[PDB]
Every structure is written in structure tokens, then in C-alpha cells.
UniProtKB/Swiss-Prot annotation:
Zinc fingers typed C3H1-type, residue spans: 43-69
Identification of the protein by name: Zinc finger CCCH-type with G patch domain-containing protein
Post-translational note: Ubiquitinated in case of infection by HIV-1, leading to its degradation. Ubiquitination is mediated by the CUL4A-RBX1-DDB1-DCAF1/VPRBP complex that is hijacked by HIV-1 via interaction between HIV-1 Vpr and DCAF1/VPRBP.
Tissue: Widely expressed.
Task of the protein: Transcription repressor that specifically binds the 5'-GGAG[GA]A[GA]A-3' consensus sequence. Represses transcription by recruiting the chromatin multiprotein complex NuRD to target promoters. Negatively regulates expression of EGFR, a gene involved in cell proliferation, survival and migration. Its ability to repress genes of the EGFR pathway suggest it may act as a tumor suppressor. Able to suppress breast carcinogenesis.
Protein species of origin: Homo sapiens (Human)
Residues represented out of the complete protein: 127 to 268 of 531
Induction (free text): Down-regulated in breast carcinomas.
Quaternary data: Interacts with CHD4/Mi-2; the interaction is direct.
Subcellular locations according to the entry: Nucleus
Superkingdom classification of source: Eukaryota
Length: 136
């Protein structure tokens, strides 16, 4: 699989396009790709570590994501995140140590370092760089 590792924009079911990564080629009934969504917001969207190695017990009911098969025609280019609008008080999605993107709020911005206050009471304040923050 030569296409494996390609960053793209894939349709996620309302219709919304989200950044994804091509895992491999697979028929949809047209020629398609199996993709994994880049920014998981729930545990079920986290990529399955065992599936990517061909060692998962599950085919449909795994705790983690095995991705979605989309037709080549439905794919769009990878949409690079725009952090220009993101300032103090802006709502955002910030990456936590648990590996998920949680709803947060920027409390400060200092030369590409964003201090975020997570909406969830169970999560501490944190400092993230541009690779750990997304516009809402
Ligand atoms: Zn799995």
C-alpha cells in the first residue's frame, strides 16, 4: 500500500469534512480508502493499536476505531488548521495527555504557546503548542 500514511480530508457522518489519514486501499461499491480520523474527541475515535498491526480480535465492535472506508471520489485535500483567529478567550479543542481533543478555552497566548482551561472539571489547566490546539 503506497497511499498508506497520506493525510487527507474525509466525509464524517450531518455531513462534515475532517482531517484523516489513509491506512490502505479497500472497495466501498467503488474503489476507496480506509481512513483514520486525525483528531479524536471521544475514546471510540482513537485509532486501534492492534488493528494497524493486524492483531485485533474485533471486526466491528472494538472499543477503538478501525477507521471508515470512503470512496476516492469523496476525498478532499488535507485542510491545514488555521490558528490565526485563536486569542485569549477563544474556544478551542486542545490535546490532553489521554490522547483526545477536549473542548477548552484559551487563557493566554505567548509566542506560539497557548494556556488552555479545559471545560471538563476533571482536567487541569495546560500549556499547548500549535500542534496541540485546533480552532472550533
Ligand atoms: Zn480494534
Amino acid at each position: 500500500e503506497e497511499l498508506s500514511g497520506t493525510k487527507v480530508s474525509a466525509p464524517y457522518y450531518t455531513l462534515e469534512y475532517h482531517n484523516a489519514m489513509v491506512v490502505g486501499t479497500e472497495e466501498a461499491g467503488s474503489a476507496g480508502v480506509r481512513v483514520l480520523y486525525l483528531y479524536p474527541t471521544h475514546k471510540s475515535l482513537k485509532p486501534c493499536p492492534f488493528f494497524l498491526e493486524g492483531k485485533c480480535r474485533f471486526k466491528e465492535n472494538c472499543r477503538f476505531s478501525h477507521g471508515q472506508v470512503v470512496s476516492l471520489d469523496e476525498l478532499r485535500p488535507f485542510q491545514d488548521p488555521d490558528l490565526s483567529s485563536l486569542q485569549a478567550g477563544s474556544a478551542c479543542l486542545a490535546k490532553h495527555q489521554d490522547g483526545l481533543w477536549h473542548a477548552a478555552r484559551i487563557t493566554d497566548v505567548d509566542n506560539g504557546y497557548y494556556t488552555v482551561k479545559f471545560d471538563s472539571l476533571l482536567l487541569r489547566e495546560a500549556v499547548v503548542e500549535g500542534d496541540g490546539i485546533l480552532p472550533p
